[PDB]
Amino acid sequence: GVDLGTENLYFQSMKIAIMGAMPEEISPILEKIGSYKSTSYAGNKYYEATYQGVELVIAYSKIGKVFSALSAATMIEHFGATKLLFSGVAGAISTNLKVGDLIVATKLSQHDLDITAFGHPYGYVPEGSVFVEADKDMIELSKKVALEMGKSVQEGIIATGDQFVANEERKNWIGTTFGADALEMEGGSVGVVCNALNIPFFILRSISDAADMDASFSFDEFLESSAKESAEFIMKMVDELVALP
Amino acid sequence: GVDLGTENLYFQSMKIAIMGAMPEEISPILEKIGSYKSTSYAGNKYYEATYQGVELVIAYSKIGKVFSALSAATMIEHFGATKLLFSGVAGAISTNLKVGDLIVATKLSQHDLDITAFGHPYGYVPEGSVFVEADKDMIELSKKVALEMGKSVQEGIIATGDQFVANEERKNWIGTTFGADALEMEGGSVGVVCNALNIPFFILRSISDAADMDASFSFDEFLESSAKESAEFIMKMVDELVALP
Ligand SMILES: Nc1ncnc2[nH]cnc12
Numbered sequence: 001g002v003d004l005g006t007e008n009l010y011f012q013s014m015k016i017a018i019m020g021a022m023p024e025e026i027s028p029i030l031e032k033i034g035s036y037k038s039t040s041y042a043g044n045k046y047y048e049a050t051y052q053g054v055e056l057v058i059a060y061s062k063i064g065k066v067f068s069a070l071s072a073a074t075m076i077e078h079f080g081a082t083k084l085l086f087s088g089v090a091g092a093i094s095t096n097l098k099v100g101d102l103i104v105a106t107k108l109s110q111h112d113l114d115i116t117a118f119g120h121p122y123g124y125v126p127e128g129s130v131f132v133e134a135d136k137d138m139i140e141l142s143k144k145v146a147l148e149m150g151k152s153v154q155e156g157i158i159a160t161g162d163q164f165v166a167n168e169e170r171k172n173w174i175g176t177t178f179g180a181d182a183l184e185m186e187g188g189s190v191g192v193v194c195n196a197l198n199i200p201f202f203i204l205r206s207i208s209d210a211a212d213m214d215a216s217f218s219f220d221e222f223l224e225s226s227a228k229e230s231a232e233f234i235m236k237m238v239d240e241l242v243a244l245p
Numbered sequence: 246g247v248d249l250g251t252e253n254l255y256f257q258s259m260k261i262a263i264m265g266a267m268p269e270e271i272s273p274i275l276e277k278i279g280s281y282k283s284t285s286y287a288g289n290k291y292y293e294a295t296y297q298g299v300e301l302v303i304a305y306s307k308i309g310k311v312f313s314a315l316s317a318a319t320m321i322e323h324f325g326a327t328k329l330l331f332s333g334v335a336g337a338i339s340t341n342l343k344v345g346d347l348i349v350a351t352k353l354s355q356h357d358l359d360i361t362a363f364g365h366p367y368g369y370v371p372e373g374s375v376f377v378e379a380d381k382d383m384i385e386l387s388k389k390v391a392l393e394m395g396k397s398v399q400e401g402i403i404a405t406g407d408q409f410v411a412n413e414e415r416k417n418w419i420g421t422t423f424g425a426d427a428l429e430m431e432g433g434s435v436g437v438v439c440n441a442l443n444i445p446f447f448i449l450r451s452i453s454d455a456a457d458m459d460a461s462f463s464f465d466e467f468l469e470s471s472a473k474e475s476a477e478f479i480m481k482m483v484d485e486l487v488a489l490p
């Protein structure tokens with residue numbers, strides 16, 4: 001076998017899944033890529049593109065843990081993704097996050113997963129883990145990108161559950177129990193699936209609201225702008241991942 | 246093309262996924278089949294068998310909606326399942342169900358899925374549905390099997406969530422809100438995935454407890470016996486599905 005050392009500039013095996021939960025979260029991705037095909041599968045549409053020597057598979061999952069698990073599994077198992085990036089919006093728990101701020105997940109839990117009647121901690125089931133770890137290399141890359149962009153990007157724990165949280169008491173329980181800086185409805189599900197399949201993943205969220213009584217209105221106001229903020233950063237990540245030595 | 250009308254007795258395309266959540270729920274399945282191979286994939290083991298002209302793929306998912314979604318998707322997408330049967334234990338809501346009684350799902354909801362801050366009903370997200378319908382043909386088959394066995398088998402709505410419910414107030418809310426006869430932690434997730442992939446499915450549960458303050462103890466006492474009850478019925482279903490004209 002002969003490899004000349006430049007093959008990756010022409011075509012490599014890497015296939016990057018880029019996912020959101022809602023159409024507003026991925027359309028800015030599809031606008032940057034511009035040209036792509038689409039496949040109807042698993043009740044959804046999966047868009048594919050040839051991008052600078054790698055291939056992209058892009059989709060929105062629909063909301064929640066089950067749909068996001070299905071899309072993540074589909075992108076890996078059926079569309080052959082080898083890395084996964086998630087872009088979307090989230091509710092802020094930490095007071096240092098405000099509308100529009102980006103947060104990269106260090107690790108994620110499922111805040112509504114509860115078999116505590118058997119004395120296990122919140123978020124745990126046998127053979128599982130309270131937290132699932134996002135990929136360290138991509139987190140480092142995100143630091144490089146943030147500086148290049150001149151942007152302030154926090155790193156923290158994101159908690160995932162199948163509820164839109166619009167209630168400070170719930171919000172505070174989640175923050176306290178898990179040390180979570182932000183909450184959302186897909187990240188931890190996606191992480192568990194990627195982890196199961198040995199696929200490194202990266203979860204990015206732009207804050208849309210503060211998970212309180214005003215959460216739904218803020219979410220409506222800032223969905224499009226926050227979604228665009230996340231998506232712009234994610235495309236910079238893709239360009240970086242294509243550039244690896 | 247020539248088909249003589251008996252090919253299905255020798256080898257057909259049908260591949261039956263048989264799934265539980267826990268090892269205790271599938272081991273009685275693997276004992277009946279006796280001989281099988283195993284594949285390590287998606288952080289789990291998937292067992293495969295050649296059974297009377299069809300092939301079986303069998304696995305336990307681990308507990309909850311994310312893991313069960315991942316296993317269902319894996320069985321279909323990677324192992325090529327074309328029908329799916331789920332066997333396990335559940336908590337009774339209806340007072341007519343007692344420990345050991347079997348319940349076949351007519352349809353299933355996710356009782357903890359909540360974006361009601363946007364005025365949608367409980368259990369609903371856009372592009373989804375409050376209930377996902379189990380396969381009518383298999384439900385009819387289950388009636389045929391129940392009579393042949395001389396067994397009383399109820400049909401009803403099963404509600405799924407990522408909580409072991411050991412609390413009458415929660416139990417009653419779930420019963421009232423969804424009209425649910427029983428609750429558990431995987432069925433509705435599995436259904437959504439099968440539905441997305443156009444795979445007919447069948448969910449069977451044997452009651453292990455009544456989802457009250459005594460739920461965990463009852464569950465421990467009756468896990469093995471209830472799991473065996475479900476598994477015996479499921480193998481009868483398989484023999485029926487192999488027998489289709
Ligand atoms: N408040 C909230 N709860 C759950 N998911 C969200 N995504 C954005 N805001 C959210």
Ligand SMILES: Nc1ncnc2[nH]cnc12
Pocket residue numbers: 334335336337408409410411428429430453454455456457460464
């Ligand atoms: N009480 C309960 N809650 C959730 N899942 C169950 N499976 C069996 N019993 C259960």
